[PDB]
Amino acid sequence: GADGVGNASGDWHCDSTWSEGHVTTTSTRTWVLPTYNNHLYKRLGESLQSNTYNGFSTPWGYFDFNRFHCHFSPRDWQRLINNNWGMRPKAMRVKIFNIQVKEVTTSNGETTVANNLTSTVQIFADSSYELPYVMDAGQEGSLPPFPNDVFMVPQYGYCGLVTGNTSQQQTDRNAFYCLEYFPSQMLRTGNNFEITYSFEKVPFHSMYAHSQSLDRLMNPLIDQYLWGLQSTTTGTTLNAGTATTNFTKLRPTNFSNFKKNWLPGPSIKQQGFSKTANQNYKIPATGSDSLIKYETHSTLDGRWSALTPGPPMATAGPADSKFSNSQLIFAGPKQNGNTATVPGTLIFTSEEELAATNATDTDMWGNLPGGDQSNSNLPTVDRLTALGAVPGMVWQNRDIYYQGPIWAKIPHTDGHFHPSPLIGGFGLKHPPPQIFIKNTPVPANPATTFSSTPVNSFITQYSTGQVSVQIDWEIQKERSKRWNPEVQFTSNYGQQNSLLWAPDAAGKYTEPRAIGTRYLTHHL
Amino acid sequence: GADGVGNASGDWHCDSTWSEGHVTTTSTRTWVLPTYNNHLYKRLGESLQSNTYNGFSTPWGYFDFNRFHCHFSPRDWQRLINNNWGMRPKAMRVKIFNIQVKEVTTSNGETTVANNLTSTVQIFADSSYELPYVMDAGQEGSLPPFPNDVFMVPQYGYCGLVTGNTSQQQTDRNAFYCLEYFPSQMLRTGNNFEITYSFEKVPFHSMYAHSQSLDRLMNPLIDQYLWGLQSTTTGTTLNAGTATTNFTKLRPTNFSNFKKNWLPGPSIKQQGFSKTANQNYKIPATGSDSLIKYETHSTLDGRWSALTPGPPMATAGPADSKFSNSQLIFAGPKQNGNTATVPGTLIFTSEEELAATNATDTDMWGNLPGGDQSNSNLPTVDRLTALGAVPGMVWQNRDIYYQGPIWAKIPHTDGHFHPSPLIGGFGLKHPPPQIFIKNTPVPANPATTFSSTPVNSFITQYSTGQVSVQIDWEIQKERSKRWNPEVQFTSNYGQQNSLLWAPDAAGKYTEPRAIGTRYLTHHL
Amino acid sequence: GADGVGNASGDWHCDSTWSEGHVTTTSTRTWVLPTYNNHLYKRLGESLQSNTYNGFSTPWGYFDFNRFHCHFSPRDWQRLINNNWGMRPKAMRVKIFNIQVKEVTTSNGETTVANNLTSTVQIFADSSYELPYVMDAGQEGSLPPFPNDVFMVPQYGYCGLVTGNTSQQQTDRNAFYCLEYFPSQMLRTGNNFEITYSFEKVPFHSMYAHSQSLDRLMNPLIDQYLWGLQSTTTGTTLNAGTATTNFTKLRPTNFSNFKKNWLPGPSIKQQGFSKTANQNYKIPATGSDSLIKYETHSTLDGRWSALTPGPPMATAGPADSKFSNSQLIFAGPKQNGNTATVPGTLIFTSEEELAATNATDTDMWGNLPGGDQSNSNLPTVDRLTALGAVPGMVWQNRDIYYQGPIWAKIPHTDGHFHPSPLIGGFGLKHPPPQIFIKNTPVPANPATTFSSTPVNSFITQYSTGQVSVQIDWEIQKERSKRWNPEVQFTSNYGQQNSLLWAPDAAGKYTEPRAIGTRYLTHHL
């Protein structure tokens, strides 16, 4: 990739091509790149007991396309989800171009901008995965959903290890990575970048809700050939009757005692809250009794971490007054602030579909006897609040969302367990590589006599250009023998003043709701 | 398959062929097919709080061979289990034939039956697995163990999802499947059906009990090179002594403190009951305090489900007065009713063999400190009642029984854990397909003037014919260097009036006991 | 097609195969055939002034598959309509088989039925179209929607010409057709029939609603270069002002005066009625002032005929209290009678979608001046109630329904106009041929001495068998660049006691609502 100054170095492609069981999304967006940290690396750190962290902020920016709406349009996502029991990324190709480097000159009063033709910009992809991976933390920076929205490239920054739960102080293990210590490609207008990636083979995402329920997978018309204890006494009253060993053949209408082959999957109880302000308990944000303490969390090296997405568990409804972590929440259309007090201002996700295989988040997994029953003792009935893997469990994973993550890098650790990103998406060992970009520094007028001191005065600059990502998605059509019509993502937003999923009168594009994927159905 | 009326369309095969490490069981049985639901599909449903269920009952019947005694004879099962450390299904072939369709005519007083030559019967195999799988729920309907016992084909019926724990009401997800919306093969006498299947590669079943115990896998003659804390004080009395840090080299006779490499597998405590009526606690069947509540159970969408078979855990003995779920119970020889009060009337299974690797069902997994010990505090000793998977665990799975299930379909869910049917058997992703069969409807005399109303009057009919299943089993001979004789399944039923495992004087075949598989032994 | 008695002569096929842009529906149903008109042809006739008719009723039955639900399942129809901007029949193959002829014998008290092996049944297809075509009159007789519903074959009967509007009397033109004067194929059990047809090339059906409206097809941001008269005076008051010739450039916000290139298509005003009983006018059924008179109708040879389906016109809504002819009405799920008084008991169709191109049924086409305006005269503003074709008109045709007609034969007349069946469907010159079937007469015991008199005594008989139709449908996927999600046929029937679009607890299948086809959208 290399030509002249007055020659576009690439074209605008915003395809959409469906077929058999392959769909290829292609999209381009214009971007802007500032001069981060005024050209330098800055060591980050701040002791915040549990929020304690340390690291570094770099002068580099980076492209992030880890959000579904970066590739599919509303209509597409609809297509995709109303006719396919699953999908998955297969291949990706990214390309940056039409680089334009600008140098600003703030006048006596206001700023004036001009084209620095010979100025260069750098790009390079960490395809060896030797740098903290940031594109999968569910953070901002991905491309805009709306094709014609210009966006700012995010600043690259990474965290180191926090030794302790007190100080951000760093050990001899903490490491510093320098992006200049990498081979980068230098570009000027007329040059361009391009790269290709191939997704690892990964399981198709569900994209369907279950019909049958795990506890009702038998023939309602027939007896088991298995027997069990029905009751130890004769009455209808606890601890009172002639006392006997009553065994049953386990036949229809019973079912809750039918011997079964599979159990619901692992769960960890979550605290449930109400959207109606006065049904909660009045826990504060800050303080020694901050919400954190009362919400189910994990503990790493003395530090707390909300069990946020957490294990795949059946959740509350999107409409239900109850909600909780485990439920993804996105900003509403009219919500533009770091804070809100009106539930109706936000968007609530829901894993209600999982109630066919997984346990409910706020409830429990089941119950255990708290001791050994006797003729002179009925044991306490304990609560199975958290339960790990056990032979015979099966479960569904969290759904995927139109404005959700697409993939996440699996942690470089010997051993794990069922690698599905908890925020959702595809867990890859080596995922789409992070592409870094940064404007090259331009020394301003220099001293006329030598100085071993590093340069300070730099011309002020910023760049802009387009970028396009093309991902090949493998999808699988359904083919069920279900007779009755299925549920489907439909418009149904009724009459409206300014069409939904479209810019308003002021020219602002905003996403009305969150869209799932599990509309279609498959049995167990 | 297609010939004449006076020409058998198949022959009777009840082989048995052993060899190297392959055994092929072949068996045929005669069957009868009624006219279920008087030809129509009926929506099922009944709100029973926790036993709540919904679904449909179909006009179709189905062949089920998911029981070991359907294929092996007593003697065979014996052969199989006294010389092989394992086995597994490899291939299957089923064929239906000698179809005979009969039409009944109830006379003024009593019924008279005749042959409807031209009447047809339908068959088809759901080999795309697009229909609720029912053959693995441990229900009745499989073939009779006794070769010369005529059997009735089961009615096909399936359950939908239960949304809630209150109402059987159905949502837009519930689905209705219609078997007529499938390509079925129509037969008349002279026609026949046939099909072949190949089992997925699946782990051989154990078929052996362990010698060594997981906690005793070392050399009893030598010291470890590892050290540990033996005691914190000097006396023989708790909280009393000169208080010191006493470390040991961990040498013979100790063993319970030896550093080991593996832990017992996951477990969930089960309530234990006594067979002697007055040692229990007098819990009722029905009621707000039904046995269910007090027995360890799971909770799906607010509904309860006994943790019946549950996790592989060492169990009580077959003779022990204590028993519990986790133990398979079959009807005794003289037990002919949906209920019983005499333990000795039934047959108790037992996983006593697992006590070499798994934890005991009624007991616990182990113990944990309930807090941090101090010089001014000895923490509560907590009970590890339920424990999921943890790096380093190992365990044995539930045994297989002569009259037990053979396989079960693994649930269509992203992710599970160690897919061994909990009732026992082989967990296949796509198992032997369900073969459906139903008599074709025959309109009785019709109206002489048109009517857009669906037909009601149907000749009364039923069919009968033979069916044969052939399964190729892969088995592995032992080859241990064990010196002393091994345990073996022996007759030993002493003297008797009417030989056991044989019809009585009245001509009734009944199975005396339940037969396991783990008679042979292998170390760890 | 010819084999033995104990050999099925065909199998049961109820496929469904989707792909690129071709879908093949295959379905089979069991049927019953009586002995119509007790074996003879009967001349029909009845003078009913306007309902006057004449013709003949035949001893033959006939297969009719001219209803969409005969081929697609609920789910299919859904598939079909949520992803395709159109479809059309391409090829058809029908086959009858498993013929079973039964002879009844009513005993002293009640009837007894037996198999008459040697009895024959006749079939033949009028593929020369030389017989009144009846399969397209929107009458009963097609196959049941539910695969497992036995149905009665309809009786063939046809009408002749009615000369007059008084008498059913027939002229020398009236003709009598005899089906025995055709080559028919005789069958016995073991024989079978089969035939193939290929649809004529015919326009794909719409299957989409319009975005843009015919009167708003310009750029809302720009002026026309055309001028027009805006007002003849100065005030804001009719007939009052300084009187002038005010011409305008015809620019935005106006639009209703913009010069346009196309006009809405032809229409004929229909009378509108209200579903709320007391908003009508109290017109009687019978009488000299029967509803007919007051409802827009056509007049052929003095006879009246409701302008029922009539011209493609925008209609009322399915929910609107107003309804009218022009709107297809089907029986509700719980409606089982030739009459009803509760609108909510029935199912209302709606062409509301056509309001983007066609005029509204109950309203009018537009307005005309009733004379020539002058400085001393303002003409009556007339109502354009009925308007035929005029250069520049464009229009959409009536939608198609899940339980609607599929095709209709175009009348054998020199000339017509835009041949789209008014009830809806595909207008073919030579459509799927009518397949006739009738049981062959079997003389009962005969006289022992000759008689030139035609036979009377016939054994009583009826037959039954299966039939299957396979139609290859050509469909076209969409490919719009629409951004916002589209409307879609979704379940959404909320919670329910007995799942919809599925048999109830009593085993009765009933269709909940009527399903259209225009869910997707295309502009103009």
Ligand SMILES: Nc1ncnc2c1ncn2[C@H]1C[C@H](O)[C@@H](COP(=O)(O)O)O1
């Ligand atoms: N998103 C995603 N990525 C990878 N694997 C997934 C994912 N979702 C479910 N699984 C399953 C597929 C295999 O059973 C498995 C292997 O983990 P392993 O530790 O590699 O043996 O985890």
Ligand SMILES: Nc1ncnc2c1ncn2[C@H]1C[C@H](O)[C@@H](COP(=O)(O)O)O1
């Ligand atoms: N009956 C049966 N069927 C299948 N697998 C069994 C069974 N019994 C034990 N296992 C083991 C074999 C592999 O370790 C495994 C894979 O589960 P997967 O989720 O496929 O990675 O589970």
Ligand SMILES: Nc1ncnc2c1ncn2[C@H]1C[C@H](O)[C@@H](COP(=O)(O)O)O1
């Ligand atoms: N259903 C159907 N069948 C046939 N033609 C249709 C139909 N619907 C719309 N049209 C149009 C297609 C041509 O413009 C036409 C020819 O009529 P002709 O008199 O043959 O010149 O009518």
